[PDB]
Design a protein around this nucleic acid. Structure first.
Lengths: 100, 184, 43, 411
RNA sequence: GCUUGUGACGGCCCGUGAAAAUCCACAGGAAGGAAUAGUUUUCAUGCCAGGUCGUACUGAGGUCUCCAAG
RNA sequence: GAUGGGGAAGCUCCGUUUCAAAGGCCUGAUUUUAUGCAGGCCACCAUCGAAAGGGAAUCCGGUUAAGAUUCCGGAACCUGG
């Protein structure tokens, strides 16, 4: 009831009734046909293409990462010594002396 | 604001109708019969609508469809042409002559109130040639007369004469005098 | 991409704006009619 | 060639604004919309909205140029002009004081007919029956309306007459397949020349008319659907069935004014049309009759009401917590059984439908993938994320139904 | 150097230096714009089309005009 | 130099925005005594008059007895959709 009309999924509250005699006369019935009538001659009609497909056929066919080893997974060496943020790095061509 | 040519002309003619001093044979009009007496004149005059072209056609085909296969009094109606009304006054057959105040050439109906006062015909200058037109199947009529009458309406007509004599002719005895239109 | 051709009504705009507007207009003409009734009884 | 002006060619002569359509026709907006309702003309959406305008981004509705350009020469427009002439020439007669000539103007009055307007709209009969879906929804609503100063009694009586003609035919040639009783009303489905029409009938209670709704738009829709239904019903009756229009018994219309009245003279394929044959139902006072006796007579049963009083009877339909008589001869049912027998077609057992117990739920007849996201373009990432959200908003609602079913089943 | 094009200056006037078609720009803030293609194409690439009439030659006291080797 | 006006017995002359109703666009749930159209925006004036004035965009090579920025080959550009 807080949501504005016409941007609403149901035009009604769903209700339970034990007896068929206990079914009320639905008050907002003239409103529904009137709004449909207005929807016929005032609402613009467009030819659309509804993309009836699975989401799975949008991911490109790419090889699974397991057949493209090796690649790094987890961390091993944590360098704790700084009081300031490590902005830059550099490695020697030989492969031991890591500068920060 | 800027108005059209004809609009300016009829507005200028309206103010010209007021602001000029006018001869007393005119402005003997516009000193006209009031609302109650006008409504009461027409409550009688509406009972004598001349039989409209459709009504006359259907009735005279009813005469043909009946009388050709297998007494009436003369019917009374209002009398409505200027040639015929000024004929009827001077006959003298007119008991109530109704005169329009608004006529296209004013010069047409200027003799008529005073000729009615001359002949002794009880006249009333009523307001609107359109309003006279309505009771007579015409757009406009300028004049409407009531010669003869049914006896049911006779006493009402005689009283309509006496009411118009008292209301119109007695209140407007000063109107034969006095040049109208001296409004500042 | 296996798309189904169909027709689509776009949502008629200002539907809620005019709805509330007509809701108000109807009530206003009711009240004005009532005011006419009273003022005619003063005649 | 000389350099052509820009915004006068492609989408500028393909479409026109509402204002430009109204002006071109030299017709009032109301009458423009009246013709638009009759002809079945609607605004259309261009690929460029601003090229369809003369450059402007503006709130504008575009009609098809050749559609309006085709509306211009039409008998209905000319007859609207004739109604306008008649209107002033009547008030001339009335306003003066002459009544006889005005009464004569009524006699010498012809009106516009919506005959040729359907031939150009629905050229084939199966196409008209594809529209009758929306046509029967207005008409059955307008039957269940109190007459106001907006809508005359003659309008509602003629609409109800067509409704009763429709109900009589569908119950005559036995063309029902599905029923669905909702809060809104009662839905039906009908193989009318084998194309399955659907239509809604409200419950027979007084309907609160809002002052919000416009009973001038709805009256023209009624005016088009009404004539459309007259021609449909003539075609149906004169093809496979009966004389049109059928008569109505006066002392039958005095009793019911529904469907057991209005007798119709002449001069199966589906299991639903073969059901209830050699069954006689005694409909009680408590149930609505006109929504139920249609279904009994459609399938092949027979109706005797409590209402008609104000034998062969094998079933009674009663909606009371305490039932009084209880004979051995009859079988006692709450109408839900009928509303399930039509849907299935297989004659559901009446053990779950006794008077005094709760009815059945009454169903309608209607990791690596997150890693392979990367190699998609933006024109594919936007679409894939949208399809993921659309499936998510469905599945979570399905989870809501499951969680609510579990929370209720405990109680 | 001659021909011609262009740039910055400086004089000469209270003489202050044609018009319109056409094209662009600014101020303005109306309106519009999303979850099985949101709104916007003054960005890039791609498609189609462009009617009528004149058009040859001469043009040298005796109409106008352009190009101009040593 | 028409039109509006005004002359002139007239052939026609005066006059060029003049005391012309000179028109072309937008807004709307369809306009509340029930389906007859309401409200707003703008205020000068047809047209002709330049092959030397303003103006979108084409060059090179080739080709005939006689045609070329027009034809051919190549390579371009502009305008509108």
């Amino acid at each position: 009831e807080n949501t504005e009309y016409s941007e609403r999924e149901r035009n009604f509250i769903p209700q339970k009734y034990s007896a068929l005699r206990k079914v009320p006369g639905y008050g907002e019935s003239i409103r529904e046909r009137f709004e449909r009538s207005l929807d016929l001659y005032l609402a613009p009609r467009v030819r659309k293409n509804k993309l009836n497909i699975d989401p799975n056929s949008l991911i490109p066919e790419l090889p699974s990462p397991k057949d493209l080893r090796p690649f790094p997974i987890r961390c091993s060496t944590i360098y704790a010594g700084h009081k300031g943020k490590v902005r830059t790095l550099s490695i020697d061509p030989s492969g031991l002396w890591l500068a920060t | 604001v800027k108005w059209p040519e004809y609009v300016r002309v009829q507005r200028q003619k309206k103010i010209l109708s007021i602001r000029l001093k006018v001869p007393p044979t005119i402005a003997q009009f516009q000193y006209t019969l009031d609302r109650n007496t006008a409504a009461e004149t027409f409550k009688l005059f509406n009972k004598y609508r001349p039989e409209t072209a459709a009504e006359k056609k259907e009735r005279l085909t009813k005469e043909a469809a009946a009388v050709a296969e297998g007494a009436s009094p003369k019917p009374y109606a209002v009398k409505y042409g200027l040639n015929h009304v000024v004929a009827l006054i001077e006959n003298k057959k007119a008991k109530l002559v109704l005169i329009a105040n608004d006529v296209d050439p004013i010069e047409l109906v200027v003799f008529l109130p005073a000729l009615c006062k001359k002949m002794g015909v009880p006249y009333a200058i009523v307001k609107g040639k359109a309003r006279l037109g309505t009771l007579v199947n015409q757009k406009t009529s300028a004049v409407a007369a009531l010669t003869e009458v049914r006896a049911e309406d006779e006493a009402a007509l005689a009283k309509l004469v006496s009411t118009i004599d008292a209301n119109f002719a007695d209140k407007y005895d000063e109107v034969k005098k006095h040049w109208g239109g001296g409004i500042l | 991409l296996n798309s189904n051709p169909e027709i689509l009504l776009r949502k008629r705009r200002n539907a809620d704006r005019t709805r509330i507007e007509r809701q108000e207009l109807a009530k206003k003409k009711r009240e004005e009619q009532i005011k006419k009734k009273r003022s005619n009884k003063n005649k | 060639m000389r350099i052509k002006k820009k915004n006068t060619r492609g989408n500028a002569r393909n479409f026109i604004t509402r204002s430009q359509a109204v002006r071109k026709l030299q017709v009032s907006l109301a009458d423009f919309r009246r013709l638009c309702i009759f002809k079945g003309i609607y605004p259309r959406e261009p690929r460029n909205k601003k090229k369809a305008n003369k450059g402007s981004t503006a709130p504008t509705t575009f009609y098809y140029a050749k559609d309006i350009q085709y509306l211009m020469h039409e008998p209905v427009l000319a007859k609207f002009r004739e109604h306008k002439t008649f209107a002033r020439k009547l008030t001339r007669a009335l306003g003066r004081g002459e009544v006889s000539s005005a009464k004569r103007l009524e006699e010498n009055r012809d009106s516009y007919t919506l005959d040729h307007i359907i031939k150009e709209r629905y050229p084939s009969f199966p196409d008209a029956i594809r529209d009758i879906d929306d046509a029967l929804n207005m008409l059955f609503l307008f039957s269940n309306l109190p007459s106001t100063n907006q809508v005359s009694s003659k309008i509602i009586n003629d609409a109800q007459k067509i409704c009763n003609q429709w109900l009589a035919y569908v119950a005559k040639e036995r063309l029902v397949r599905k029923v669905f009783v909702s809060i809104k009303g009662v839905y039906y489905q009908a193989n009318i020349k084998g194309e399955e029409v659907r239509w809604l009938v409200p419950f027979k209670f007084p309907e609160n008319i809002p002052s919000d709704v416009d009973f001038r738009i709805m009256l023209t829709f009624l005016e088009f659907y009404s004539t459309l239904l007259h021609f449909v019903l003539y075609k149906l009756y004169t093809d496979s069935g009966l004389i049109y229009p059928p008569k109505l018994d006066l002392k039958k219309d005095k009793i019911i004014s529904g469907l057991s009245s209005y007798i119709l003279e002449s001069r199966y394929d589906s299991p639903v049309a073969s059901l209830f044959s050699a069954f006689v139902f005694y409909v009680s006072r408590e149930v609505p009759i006109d929504i139920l006796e249609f279904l009994i007579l459609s399938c092949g049963g027979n109706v005797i009401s409590e209402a008609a009083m104000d034998s062969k009877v094998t079933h009674q339909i009663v909606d009371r917590p305490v039932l009084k008589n209880k004979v051995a001869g009859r079988t006692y049912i709450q109408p839900q059984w009928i509303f399930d027998c039509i849907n299935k077609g297989e004659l559901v057992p009446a053990n779950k439908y006794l008077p005094g117990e709760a009815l059945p739920p009454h169903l309608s007849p209607w990791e690596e993938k997150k890693l392979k996201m990367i190699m998609m373009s933006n024109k594919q990432k936007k679409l894939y994320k949208k399809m993921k959200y659309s499936n998510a908003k469905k599945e979570e609602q399905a989870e809501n139904l499951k969680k609510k079913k579990k929370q209720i089943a405990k109680q």
